[PDB]
Design a protein around this ligand. Structure first.
Ligand SMILES: [Cl-]
Ligand SMILES: [Cl-]
Ligand SMILES: [Fe+3]
Ligand SMILES: [Fe+3]
Ligand SMILES: [Fe+3]
Ligand SMILES: [Fe+3]
Ligand SMILES: [O-]
Ligand SMILES: [O-]
Lengths: 143, 144
């Protein structure tokens, strides 16, 4: 491992860097599909390659987070070992299906956006499925 | 009106949902590499397949964001047209190389983490390159 990063500004900067790099990869792949449709294959290919750069950046942020004794940016749980990684996935998916997406759906219906609410409700069910599958992984790793 | 979401709580929830889904895909692909090394191909395959689910979720959030007249979660810029998408990329990468990563690197050096600082400095130069590449894309879309 490396030097303990707990309590530093650098620890928070690695977290914020990870968030930005994660968004960037998703955004650029989404933009590339628009270039695909419109017939700009060289632009689309460049966007996809830049997206690979943002993957490398996000993974590198996680390397320093992990080696510096810090927790998962998304869940505040340790991600040193594979079992811990799966436990972090479980915690995040559980938050999403028990709290986040059901709340998003309720608000969307209150604000008069039932189609968006249906989407959030679909996702709530999907994250519960994800959580159950990750829990099956953990039981098998621990057995 | 689902086509005008501006100023609503649903607008903020779509943004936060996109952020979480984006992180989830990155996290699960990263975790899959550990399963790969240790010889857990079924676990790695599950992580990768669930990661595809989180991609679909993130992209769907962006669909509703764009259809509702909302802005890019990362830059607060419109992303309706391809040119707007590229202009959002330029703005974000420019912020990253002129301000964010240089500031992160300075803090890392002052806090005694030179390896992290060097990483942030590498990324600052990388985002400058990315910004220039997106700038070229825009020139090409405009006729260049
Ligand atoms: Cl092209
Ligand atoms: Cl396996
Ligand atoms: Fe980057
Ligand atoms: Fe999820
Ligand atoms: Fe999801
Ligand atoms: Fe970037
Ligand atoms: O980035
Ligand atoms: O998710």
């Amino acid at each position: 491992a490396m030097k303990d990063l707990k309590g530093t500004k650098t620890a928070e900067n690695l977290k914020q860097g990870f968030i930005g790099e994660s968004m960037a990869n998703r955004r650029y792949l989404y933009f590339a599909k628009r270039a695909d449709e419109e017939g700009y294959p060289e632009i689309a290919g460049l966007l996809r390659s830049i997206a690979e750069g943002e993957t490398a950046h996000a993974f590198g942020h996680l390397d320093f987070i992990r080696q510096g004794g810090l927790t998962d940016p998304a869940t505040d749980k340790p991600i040193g070992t594979l079992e811990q990684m799966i436990e972090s996935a479980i915690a995040g998916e559980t938050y999403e299906w028990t709290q986040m997406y059901p709340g998003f759906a309720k608000v969307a219906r209150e604000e008069g956006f039932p189609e968006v609410a249906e989407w959030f409700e679909t996702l709530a069910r999907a994250e519960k499925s994800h959580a159950e599958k990750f829990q099956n992984v953990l039981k098998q790793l621990k057995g």
